[PDB]
Amino acid sequence: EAIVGKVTEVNKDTFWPIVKAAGDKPVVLDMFTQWCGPSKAMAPKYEKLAEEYLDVIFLKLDCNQENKTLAKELGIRVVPTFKILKENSVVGEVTGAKYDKLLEAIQAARS
Amino acid sequence: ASYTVKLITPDGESSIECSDDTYILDAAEEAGLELPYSCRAGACSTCAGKITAGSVDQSDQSFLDDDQIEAGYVLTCVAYPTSDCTIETHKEEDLY
Amino acid sequence: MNVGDRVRVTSSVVVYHHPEHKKTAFDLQGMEGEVAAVLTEWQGRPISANLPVLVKFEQRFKAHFRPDEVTLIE
Amino acid sequence: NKTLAAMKNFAEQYAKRTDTYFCSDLSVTAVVIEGLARHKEELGSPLCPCRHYEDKEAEVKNTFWNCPCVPMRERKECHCMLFLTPDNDFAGDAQDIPMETLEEVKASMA
Ligand code: SF4
Numbered sequence: 422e423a424i425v426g427k428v429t430e431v432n433k434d435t436f437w438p439i440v441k442a443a444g445d446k447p448v449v450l451d452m453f454t455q456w457c458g459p460s461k462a463m464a465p466k467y468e469k470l471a472e473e474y475l476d477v478i479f480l481k482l483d484c485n486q487e488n489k490t491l492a493k494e495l496g497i498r499v500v501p502t503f504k505i506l507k508e509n510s511v512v513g514e515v516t517g518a519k520y521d522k523l524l525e526a527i528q529a530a531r532s
Numbered sequence: 533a534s535y536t537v538k539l540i541t542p543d544g545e546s547s548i549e550c551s552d553d554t555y556i557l558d559a560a561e562e563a564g565l566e567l568p569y570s571c572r573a574g575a576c577s578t579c580a581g582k583i584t585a586g587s588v589d590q591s592d593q594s595f596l597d598d599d600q601i602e603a604g605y606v607l608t609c610v611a612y613p614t615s616d617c618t619i620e621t622h623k624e625e626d627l628y
Numbered sequence: 629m630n631v632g633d634r635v636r637v638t639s640s641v642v643v644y645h646h647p648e649h650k651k652t653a654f655d656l657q658g659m660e661g662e663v664a665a666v667l668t669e670w671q672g673r674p675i676s677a678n679l680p681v682l683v684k685f686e687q688r689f690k691a692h693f694r695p696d697e698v699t700l701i702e
Numbered sequence: 703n704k705t706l707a708a709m710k711n712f713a714e715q716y717a718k719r720t721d722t723y724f725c726s727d728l729s730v731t732a733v734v735i736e737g738l739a740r741h742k743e744e745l746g747s748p749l750c751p752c753r754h755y756e757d758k759e760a761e762v763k764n765t766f767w768n769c770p771c772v773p774m775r776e777r778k779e780c781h782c783m784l785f786l787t788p789d790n791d792f793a794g795d796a797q798d799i800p801m802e803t804l805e806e807v808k809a810s811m812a
């Protein structure tokens with residue numbers, strides 16, 4: 422249900438439905454917070470990845486108190502943290518504002 | 533060993549009995565005073581307070597330069613009482 | 629590990645709060661202190677200190693490490 | 703807001719006193735100060751705005767992640783990128799940040 426080629430923001434009630442609906446396109450999740458520098462640094466570069474890799478759904482999760490339960494279900498301590506899913510399940514992860522990493526990580530999913 | 537610290541809270545005035553080998557902040561807390569703080573290792577300027585009268589021993593402090601201490605400030609999370617004294621709490625908002 | 633144990637810094641640990649070389653880099657590796665606290669909770673609710681093992685050394689100096697940066701002795 | 707000020711002034715003085723430098727992209731520095739301060743205004747302590755906790759109120763009483771946090775204090779490791787050591791690819795040659803900057807980064811942030 423998320424818009425391809427763009428970064429879609431989800432919540433505890435919309436993440437799993439969207440993931441279960443990506444089929445073959447790998448999903449990338451940005452777990453962030455509104456006032457965390459590194460996260461903010463990745464923001465711009467994270468959007469462009471979405472715009473550049475139209476064959477991968479890019480999502481984002483505000484890790485506040487409204488989404489505390491999903492955040493716990495997924496698992497996070499460092500911000501930002503990217504979970505990578507392919508076929509209804511997490512297959513890899515990247516913690517920190519590492520463009521080089523997050524990327525090589527994505528490229529692995531586009532198999 | 534115990535001196536009597538007088539704290540000038542923005543909400544009122546309080547006087548607690550701080551021992552000599554105890555920090556003003558930790559002393560304040562035993563009487564139910566809710567004084568501010570962050571690190572509690574004399575490295576920030578949150579617990580920061582000011583001396584109106586008396587002598588402390590904030591020798592473990594490390595964030596306040598020489599001009600700030602001479603100006604009369606102090607870090608209550610690391611400040612030790614050396615005499616009876618009066619410290620104004622919440623004195624950061626105008627420390628810079 | 630637990631409070632009371634004696635330990636040795638078996639991994640590169642560069643602090644800056646050492647009275648010996650205050651305000652300047654210094655590798656703690658090789659020093660033997662004693663675990664003084666292990667931070668995992670606080671009033672029943674979990675904390676998340678990335679360096680939960682607190683060790684107290686010689687010269688009223690103490691530092692924080694991860695479990696792997698230290699090895700029990702005896 | 704007066705709280706946002708102190709947080710900024712702590713930042714500047716702490717960087718100078720430890721020779722740490724602010725990130726080249728001061729916007730990153732403004733958000734670490736904003737969220738750093740936006741925490742003091744809610745929990746009473748500048749609890750690190752760049753990590754996820756299970757119980758902020760508790761994290762704060764423990765004080766491990768209260769800025770300056772243990773790591774930054776013992777090992778100069780500031781995960782928020784507020785304080786970077788010289789030999790760091792993100793550093794800048796600044797230890798101060800115009801107050802006008804944070805305010806404008808508080809709005810552009812949307
Ligand atoms: S020094 Fe530690 S507490 Fe302060 S902003 Fe950096 S990570 Fe957060």
Ligand code: FES
Nearest residue numbers: 570571572576579
């Ligand atoms: S909490 Fe850092 S000096 Fe008091």
